[PDB]
Paper text:
Afterwards, the choline kinase LicA phosphorylates choline in the cytoplasm to form phosphocholine, which is further activated into CDP-choline by the phosphocholine cytidylyl transferase LicC. Here we determined the crystal structures of apo-form LicA at 1.94 Å (apo-LicA) and two complex forms with choline (LicA-choline) and AMP/MES (LicA-AMP-MES) at 2.01 Å and 1.45 Å, respectively.
Each asymmetric unit contains two molecules of LicA. The interface between the two molecules is about 650 Å2, which is not large enough to maintain a stable dimer. In fact, LicA exists as a monomer in solution, which was confirmed by gel-filtration chromatography. In the apo-form state, the enzyme adopts an open conformation (1), with the P-loop protruding outwards from a wider active-site pocket. Despite no metal observed in the three structures, we propose that the activity of LicA is dependent on Mg2+, as deprivation of metal ions using ethylenediaminetetraacetic acid (EDTA) drastically diminished its activity by 6 fold.
Numbering used by the authors:
A (entry chain A): -1 to 13, 18 to 283
B (entry chain B): -1 to 13, 19 to 283
The structure:
Amino acid sequence: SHMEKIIKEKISSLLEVLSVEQLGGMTNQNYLAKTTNKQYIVKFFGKGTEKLINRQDEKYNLELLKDLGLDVKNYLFDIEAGIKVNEYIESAITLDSTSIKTKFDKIAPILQTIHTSAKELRGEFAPFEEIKKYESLIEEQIPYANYESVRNAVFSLEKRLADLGVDRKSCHIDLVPENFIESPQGRLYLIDWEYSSMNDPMWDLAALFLESEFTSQEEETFLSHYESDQTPVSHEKIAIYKILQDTIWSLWTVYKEEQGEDFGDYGVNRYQRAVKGLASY
Amino acid sequence: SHMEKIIKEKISSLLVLSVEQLGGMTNQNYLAKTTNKQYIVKFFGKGTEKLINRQDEKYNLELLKDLGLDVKNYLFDIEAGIKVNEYIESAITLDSTSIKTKFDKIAPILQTIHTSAKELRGEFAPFEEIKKYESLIEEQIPYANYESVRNAVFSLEKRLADLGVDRKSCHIDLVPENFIESPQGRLYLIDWEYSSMNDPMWDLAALFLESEFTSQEEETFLSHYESDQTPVSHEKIAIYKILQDTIWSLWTVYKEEQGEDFGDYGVNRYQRAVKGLASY
């Protein structure tokens, strides 16, 4: 297999490869390389995700955040090749929408650490600008019902956020539960910092809550772990960022599906939840 | 009788049909009906010194004037234990029901005071305020299981410190009846006797608690109030509700030691702190 061979030549500089396995997620460009000694996570990136992710920026941000010890080790990051190679924590457990709700005392400290880090990431996340970005990148008509009316309801939140005050801190930006992994010592790592950018920390909170479908009670309990003098909490900003997230990810989905991918109902389901969020708000 | 006769011989230097005794959390307030104007006559003395620094109150009245939130004060005579205010004729005094229709008016008033940047005389340190009442109370505190409840309340000091405590000009006493609607349409916020430096969440907690806001009403009000300059912490609000019920329950014990009778006000406020501690 040619893909199998390419991986062997990309990682031999770090060494007896016994196995290469295709990994899921939301990018088919992920592989697991098993060696005699160690196991490696091999990530590819080429054409589609450029125009989305600045890889030079990502490389800087990886180097930047290393001392926080939140992410796993990165061995290789070569933009030329389009190759990323990370440490694979063997016998580590990936969190999901159920198990994440048992880990508040570990997740809250992780989020406090990044949000209060004073780290200056390359990249600013300006959600309305991001919406404009995806709109520009999408070639066909956006397939979602009532889009022009929804878009304009969403854009009315910009003034609201401005009135509420927008903070600018280092954020992960993509707190799906599978981005948390627990090692045997019970240490939680937060991985996959590809979208990471300066933003309001309430974005990260909204993402955590939304991706795992936190109940109102679970949100309040999590906020009691998280809220502090250095980490203030705005419930309204969270509600607004949930809508912006559903909007942005639904558009991301349309773009990705034009670039080859198929995510079933993922896009429409997120879009419709944005519409519901707008009606409740 | 003699009450009418002190009032005339005090408010005379401002110019008298009748005089009426007003209800509430005091029996020392009087309505003086005058030919041209209506007056609120407020008496204080020994029963409220050691609680209210009347010199600081007078300074604070002066400092807060440019906000234009309170009614006109004509006379503030400390030496004589007498305060005289404008009374707003044909005003609507808000209550726990009507206050909930006035969010678009109340929220900017609270924003105006909280962002005033004014340095009032008086710091409101709630745990120090609890220690103060305990010292002032001469008989035992009658509230059941007080030691254990007080220990629980004092555990909130560290939590508040972890959350961060802000220090701003606050009204400190947001009973609905302190909001007055003029027939002209404007709202007045009156009775600034307790006003001092505190976290603005104390004021929000007082507003919510004194008028028994529902969760939804609180949420709606917060949407009017929350801004970059006036951030909101729900947890801090829940904590200040407990501290308020505790402090006012103790204030009640102190006042009743002077012979005043608030019925079940004190114990009900105490139990609401107890119940707040259990829910928290």
